Ligand binder design. Structure first.
Ligand SMILES: CN[C@@H]1[C@@H](O)[C@@H](O[C@@H]2[C@@H](O)[C@H](O[C@H]3O[C@H]([C@@H](C)O)[C@@H](O)[C@H](O)[C@H]3N)[C@@H](N)C[C@H]2N)OC[C@]1(C)O
Ligand SMILES: CN[C@@H]1[C@@H](O)[C@@H](O[C@@H]2[C@@H](O)[C@H](O[C@H]3O[C@H]([C@@H](C)O)[C@@H](O)[C@H](O)[C@H]3N)[C@@H](N)C[C@H]2N)OC[C@]1(C)O
Ligand SMILES: CN[C@@H]1[C@@H](O)[C@@H](O[C@@H]2[C@@H](O)[C@H](O[C@H]3O[C@H]([C@@H](C)O)[C@@H](O)[C@H](O)[C@H]3N)[C@@H](N)C[C@H]2N)OC[C@]1(C)O
Ligand SMILES: CN[C@@H]1[C@@H](O)[C@@H](O[C@@H]2[C@@H](O)[C@H](O[C@H]3O[C@H]([C@@H](C)O)[C@@H](O)[C@H](O)[C@H]3N)[C@@H](N)C[C@H]2N)OC[C@]1(C)O
Ligand SMILES: CN[C@@H]1[C@@H](O)[C@@H](O[C@@H]2[C@@H](O)[C@H](O[C@H]3O[C@H]([C@@H](C)O)[C@@H](O)[C@H](O)[C@H]3N)[C@@H](N)C[C@H]2N)OC[C@]1(C)O
Lengths: 155, 148, 185
RNA sequence: AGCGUGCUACUUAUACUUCACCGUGAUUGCUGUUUUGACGCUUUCACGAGUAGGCAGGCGUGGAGGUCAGUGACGAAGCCUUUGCUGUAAAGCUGGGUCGAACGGCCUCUAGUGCAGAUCUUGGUGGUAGUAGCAAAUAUUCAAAUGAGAACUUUGAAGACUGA
RNA sequence: UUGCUUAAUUGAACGUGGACAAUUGAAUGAAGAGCUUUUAGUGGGCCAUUUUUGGUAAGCAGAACUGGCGAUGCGGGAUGA
RNA sequence: GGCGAAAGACUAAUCGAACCAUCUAGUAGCUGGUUCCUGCCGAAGUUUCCCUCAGGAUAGCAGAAGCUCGUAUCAGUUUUAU
RNA sequence: GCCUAGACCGAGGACUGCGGUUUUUACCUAGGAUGUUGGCAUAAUGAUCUUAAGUCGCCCGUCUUGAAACACGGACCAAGGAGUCUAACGUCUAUGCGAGUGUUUGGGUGUAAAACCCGUACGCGUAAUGAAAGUGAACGAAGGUGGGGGCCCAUUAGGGUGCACCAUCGACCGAUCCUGAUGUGUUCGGAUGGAUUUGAGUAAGAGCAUAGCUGUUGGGACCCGAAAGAUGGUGAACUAUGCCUG
RNA sequence: GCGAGAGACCGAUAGCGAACAAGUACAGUGAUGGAAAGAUGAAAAGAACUUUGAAAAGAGAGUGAAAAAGUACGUGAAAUUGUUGAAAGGGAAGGGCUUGAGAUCAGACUUGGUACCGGGCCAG
C-alpha cells in the first residue's frame, strides 16, 4: 500500500468571506392581518383560521379561534396556507406580545398560553359575530369536491 | 529485456501489429538479395548504384603488406617529438641543432603536407614525402632525409 | 463538433528536460531554470535549453575553435561558454589566456588552458560570476560533421555517401556509377 | 388521419448554450517561505469518433541482486463464498469457510510472462438418452435337488433338431 | 568591379556611399514558422450528386471533380454500409 | 523393382510406383490462429518498375524523436491587375 | 423602465481585485450559498444481489467493398498453446573517455567460472582519390557576399562581434581534357598556365566502446499445414507368375 | 565411457520417451513404433468389539492433531450431477438503462467534550 507523505497535511482551511447578507421576506399581497386562512397541511389541515400577526421568523400567527375550531394560537408557514378574500377586522385584538420566543420549546399547557387564548378569543368573537354565518364558516372544514378546479376557483 | 519489447504490448491484439490484409507470411519477395535485377531494381538503383557489373583489373594473390604506408600530415608532426622536451625544442632549435623526427619508427610511411609547421627547423626522416610537405619543411629551415 | 484547423493534442516537439538521469546535470538544470525564470537575461534561457540537448546535438568544441572565437575583434576578454565537452587540439601552435566555462574538459584541453594561465570553470561557477551571462561568448561545435550525416538524403544525383560495409573497386562502382557500365547517377 | 397551399403552437439527438467532474495539449506564477516531492505545487484556456497501424503510461506471472532485523503451525500457499472497500480499467485489499508449510511489500534485474477461438494439444465431462437398440441359424416345457437368490446350474420326465 | 558586351565613356550582372520608416505600398485568417532523421500499415475498394464511355439494359463494365462508406456510433428515413 | 490370359491389375485392408526410419521443424507469393488495460495520434486500396496480375520494391498517405528559431511570410479563400 | 410564476445548479475556501453607496479606513447584491427551523440516529438515507415492469439490445472470432447471415471455426471445462535467440547491421537515446578509443586472445592475481590488475599487437577513427602505375589537401586573419541566436556599445531605434546552421561566388587535394620551362639514358621529365568536366574529399578533427527500444538480412526464424524430392533398410503369412512335392 | 562439482534451468500435460518393476506394458510378419502412471499419517496407530445384511457393505464403537487423512487415501478448482432453501416462468434464454419489491451491507451522537455545549444525516 502507498504510505502517507510529509506534505500531505490535515490542516483545515477557513472558509472564504461569504457575501450573503440576508434581507427581509416579502410576503404575498393577499396576506393581510385579519384574512381568513385555509390550512393545507399539518394536524389542522382543512381548518379555516384567522391570520393575526407576521412574526420575525417568517411564520404567521393564527387562531381558530380555539373555541370555534379547536385550533389555538400557533405558527403556520405562509406556503402551506390559502389566503381567502374573507376578512376579520383585527384592529381590536392585542397581539403585541406574541413572538418567536413565545413559542420557544419548554399534555399539560402553561396557564400563560390558556390565558392568552381566552383573551384573543374574546376579541375575535366580538368581531366575528358581526358577519352573518362567519362563525359557522370558520367552524367547518375545507375540502375539494368533485368538479372543483383550484386554478379556476377564487378563494 | 523482453519486458520492454512491443511483443508484450501486442498481447490481446489479433494480428500482433502485422495487419489483417497483408498477413505476415514467410518470404514474400524472396530470400536475401533475390530479384535485385527484377522486382528489387527500384531499391538497388536508388540506394546502391554501382552494384551490378565489373570495374577494373584483378590482382591475384594480393598481399596487403606491400601497400602499408600510414600517412602523417605536417600539422601533426610535432606530436612525435618527446612531450617533455617539446617546449624547449621550439625555442632552442637552430640550423646547427634541430630536432630529429623518425616518422617510420613512429609507424608512418609518408609525410603529407596539410597544415602549418612551427617556424622552427626540424629534421624529418621518412620513407616517402609529398612535394608540398618537403617544400614547407625546407621553408622553416628544415630538411627531409629519406630512409628505407 | 468542430471543424479543426490544426491537429489536436500535439506535443510541443521540443525537449523540456534532460533525457539524462545524471543528478548533477539535474542540479545545473535546477539552477538555470531559476535563472531563466527570475532574471530575463536571454543568455540564461539559451543555456537552459542547451542543458536539455542530446549528445549528437552537443558536438565537442576544440580549443582551436575557442582560440579562433577569442581572436574576434573585441572578444579577447570574453568568457567562452560551451554546454558540452572541450577537447584538446594538437594542431594548435599557441593558446591564449582565457576563461572557458564548460560541462566537461578533456585532460589535454584542461592542461593546455591552465598551462597558458587560463581558467577552466564549470557552469555553476559561471552562474555565480556572471548571473546574466555578461561578457560571455557561446561557442557551438559542428553538428553536421557527424559521419552519419554523410548518408542522409541519399538518392540519384544527390552526391551523398552510400551506406556500405566494405570499400573497394568491387563495391558499388559499376553500373549506375559509370557511363561505361550503362549509366551514371 | 387523402392531395395543393398558408399559419399558430408543440415534441425531441451523443448537435448548440451555461455549469460540474475526468483526461490530453498549451498556459500563469512559485528560493532571505525551497518547506525532506521543483519529475513538485499553482493560474488560465482550448480540445476528446476511430479499423490497419504507431507511440506513451500502467496492471498481472516464474525466477535473480538489495531492503522491510516483513507475514506464518496462535495457521503460509491454494481453494469456496450477495462480508465488504479501492481503481475508468488491467487489477489490488479485506470478512467467513476449507486447509496444512511456506510466503509477501518496496527498489531494481531477468524471461519458456497474460488465451475464447487455431476442423489447436492432452485430459476430463454433457445434451442426445434410459434413447438406437440387444429380431439370421425350427423350441421349448414340468418336477426335484442345490442355493440368500434359479427363464439361464445339476438330475429325472418329455418335446425337438443336426440326419453319417 | 570584370577576362563578358557596345562604335563608345554603351550595356549586363553584382556592389560602396546617400535618401525614403510603421499605410513597408489590397482583403480575411494564422494552437507560430522553418528544418531533419527514422519506421508501421496499405498497394482487391465501394457508394451518391454532377460530367461521361461501351452496352437493349443491368444492383453491368470503364473514366472526371467533390463528398462519403470502408474505419462510425448517434436523431430521422418502419426496416437498410 | 517384381509379377501381369493386360484391369495400370496385383505386390500383407497400402499401388498411375509398397512399407519403415532418416535427410526434415523440407519450401509455401496460399488457408487458419496469434494471449492484459487505459491514453494520444491515425491510414491505404493510388504513382513507377517487376514471368508483374491472390506477391514485392518505389513514391504517397501515418506515427515517433526531435532540432533551429519566435511573427519571419504563409493559405484547398476573396479583391485588384494581367 | 416596472410588476409577477416556475425549474436546475452552489464549483471555490483567510485576506489581496474591479466597482458601487456614501451617511465612514466604513458598508455592499461588487473575484462561485448562506440563514433559520423540524425530524431522525433501535433509524428517514445510500450501494450491491435477486426479481417485476418500461424501453432499447441479432453471435462471437474471421477473410471481405459489403456478415446476424442460407460464408467458415466454435457442444462444454481445465491445463498447455504462437515475433524468440544468435551473427552482422541502419536511425535514435543514455554513459565513459576523447584525436583517440576498445582490460577479458592472452598474462597477473584470487575469498576461484566472480571481483581486482597488465600490456604488445590488432580493430575502428585520425585522408582522400584513381581501373591502375601513382599522386595527395591554407593566396588571404582557413577567403568574399546575404541571413543568423547570444554577447558588446547606445539612448525606441541604431552600431559592432557574430559560433551552430542555411543560400551563394571563390581557393585547396585526387581522376579527366589541354598547355608544355630549365633540363635530358632523345624519350623521358613536367616547371607554368587553362577547361559549361569528375570524387562516397579539404577548408581549427569526432570518434571508439558498452547498453536499450525500433527497423533489416541469414538462420526451424511468430505458430501449425502440402502434393513432392533424396539416402539407407523391411516385406510374396494377402495376392500375381514359374517351379517341386501332395 | 569412468569420476566429480555446479546453475538467475524444469518442476510430474513441465523436465530425457522414461522422477515409478521404461525402452516397460502394448502394436506390427518385419524394419520399426511405443505410452499412462509421483504425495495416507510423525507413527499403521490400516479401525479390536457389538449389531443389520447371503455378501459387498452399513450403523455404532475405536485410532489419530485431523478420518473435513480410511490404502477409491495431501490440498481437492471447473465442466457436469444429486438433495435442500429461495424465486421466476403463454413459441428460447441471456444484456444495458431506470425504479419498485424482497434480501444483504454501510454509516457520527464523533476516540464526541464538559444536565449543558456542540456536531452528523434527511427535509421545510
Ligand atoms: C442548370 N444546370 C444543372 C446543374 O446546376 C445541376 O443541377 C442540380 C440538380 O441536378 C440537383 O438535382 C440532383 O440531385 C437531387 C438531390 C440528390 O440533391 C436529386 O433529387 C435530383 O434528381 C438530381 N437531378 C439539384 N438539387 C440542384 C441543381 N443545381 O445538374 C443539372 C444541370 C442541368 O446540369
Ligand atoms: C588550378 N587548376 C588545376 C589545373 O591547372 C590542373 O593542374 C595541373 C595538374 O593536374 C598537373 O598534375 C597532374 O599531372 C602530373 C604529371 C604531369 O606528373 C601528376 O603527377 C599529377 O598527379 C596530376 N594531378 C600538373 N603537372 C600541372 C597542373 N597545372 O589540375 C586541375 C586544377 C585543380 O583545375
Ligand atoms: C577547373 N574549373 C573550375 C571548376 O571545375 C569549378 O571547380 C570545382 C569546384 O566547384 C568543386 O567544388 C564543389 O564541390 C565541392 C564538393 C566536392 O565537396 C564543394 O565543397 C564545393 O563547395 C563546390 N564548389 C571542386 N570539388 C572541384 C573543382 N574543380 O570551379 C570553377 C572553375 C575554376 O572553373
Ligand atoms: C569560416 N570558414 C569557413 C570554413 O569553416 C569552411 O566552411 C564549411 C563550408 O564550406 C561547408 O559548405 C560547403 O560544402 C557544402 C557541402 C554540403 O558540399 C556545400 O553545399 C556548400 O555550398 C559549401 N559552401 C559547410 N558544410 C561546413 C563549413 N564549416 O569553408 C568555408 C570557410 C568560409 O572557409
Ligand atoms: C491405487 N490406484 C492408483 C493410485 O495410486 C493412483 O494415485 C493417485 C495419486 O497419483 C494422486 O496423487 C497425486 O498428487 C498430486 C496432486 C494432483 O494430488 C499429483 O500431482 C501427483 O501426480 C500424484 N501423486 C492421489 N491424489 C490419488 C491417487 N489415486 O495412481 C494410479 C492408480 C492406478 O489409480
Amino acid at each position: 500500500q502507498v504510505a502517507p507523505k510529509w506534505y500531505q497535511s490535515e490542516d483545515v482551511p477557513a472558509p472564504k468571506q461569504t457575501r450573503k447578507t440576508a434581507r427581509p421576506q416579502k410576503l404575498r399581497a393577499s396576506l393581510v392581518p385579519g384574512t381568513v386562512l385555509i390550512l393545507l397541511a399539518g394536524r389542522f389541515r382543512g381548518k379555516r383560521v384567522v391570520y393575526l400577526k407576521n412574526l420575525e421568523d417568517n411564520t404567521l400567527l393564527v387562531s381558530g379561534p380555539f373555541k370555534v375550531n379547536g385550533v389555538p394560537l400557533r405558527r403556520v408557514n405562509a406556503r402551506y396556507v390559502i389566503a381567502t378574500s374573507t376578512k376579520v377586522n383585527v384592529s381590536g385584538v392585542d397581539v403585541s406580545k406574541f413572538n418567536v420566543e413565545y413559542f420557544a420549546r419548554e399534555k399539560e399547557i402553561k396557564a400563560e398560553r390558556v390565558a392568552d387564548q381566552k383573551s384573543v378569543d374574546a376579541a375575535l368573537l366580538s368581531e366575528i359575530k358581526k358577519t352573518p354565518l362567519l362563525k359557522q364558516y370558520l367552524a367547518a372544514s375545507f375540502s375539494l369536491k368533485n368538479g372543483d378546479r383550484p386554478h379556476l376557483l377564487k378563494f | 529485456p523482453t519486458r520492454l519489447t512491443k511483443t508484450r504490448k501486442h498481447r490481446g491484439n489479433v494480428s500482433a501489429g502485422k495487419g489483417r490484409i497483408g498477413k505476415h507470411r514467410k518470404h514474400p519477395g524472396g530470400r536475401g538479395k533475390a530479384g535485385g535485377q527484377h522486382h528489387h531494381r527500384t531499391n538497388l538503383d536508388k540506394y546502391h548504384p554501382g552494384y551490378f557489373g565489373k570495374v577494373g583489373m584483378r590482382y591475384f594473390h594480393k598481399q596487403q603488406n606491400h601497400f602499408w604506408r600510414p600517412e602523417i600530415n605536417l600539422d601533426k608532426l610535432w606530436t612525435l617529438v618527446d612531450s617533455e622536451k617539446k617546449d624547449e625544442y621550439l625555442s632552442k632549435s637552430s640550423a646547427s641543432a634541430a630536432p630529429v623526427i623518425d616518422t617510420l619508427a613512429h609507424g608512418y610511411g609518408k609525410v603529407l603536407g596539410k597544415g602549418r609547421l612551427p617556424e622552427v627547423p626540424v629534421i624529418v626522416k621518412a620513407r616517402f614525402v609529398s612535394k608540398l610537405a618537403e617544400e614547407k619543411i625546407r621553408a622553416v629551415g628544415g630538411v627531409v632525409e629519406l630512409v628505407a | 463538433g468542430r471543424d479543426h484547423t490544426s491537429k489536436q493534442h500535439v506535443r510541443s516537439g521540443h525537449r523540456t528536460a534532460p533525457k539524462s538521469d545524471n543528478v548533477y546535470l539535474q542540479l545545473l538544470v535546477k539552477l538555470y531554470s531559476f535563472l531563466a525564470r527570475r532574471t530575463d537575461a536571454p543568455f540564461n534561457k539559451v543555456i537552459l535549453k542547451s542543458l536539455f540537448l542530446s549528445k549528437i546535438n552537443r558536438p565537442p568544441v576544440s580549443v582551436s575553435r575557442i582560440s579562433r572565437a577569442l581572436k574576434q575583434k573585441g572578444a579577447a576578454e570574453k568568457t567562452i561558454v560551451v554546454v558540452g565537452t572541450v577537447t584538446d587540439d594538437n594542431r594548435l601552435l599557441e593558446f591564449p589566456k582565457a576563461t572557458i566555462a564548460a560541462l566537461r574538459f578533456t585532460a589535454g584541453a584542461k592542461d593546455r588552458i591552465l598551462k597558458n594561465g587560463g581558467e577552466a570553470i564549470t557552469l555553476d561557477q559561471l552562474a555565480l560570476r556572471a548571473p546574466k551571462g555578461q561578457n560571455t561568448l557561446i561557442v557551438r561545435g559542428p553538428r553536421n560533421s557527424r559521419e552519419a550525416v554523410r548518408h542522409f538524403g541519399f538518392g540519384p544525383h544527390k552526391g551523398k555517401a552510400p551506406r556500405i560495409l566494405s570499400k573497394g573497386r568491387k563495391f558499388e562502382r559499376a553500373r549506375g556509377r559509370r557511363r561505361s557500365r550503362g549509366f551514371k547517377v
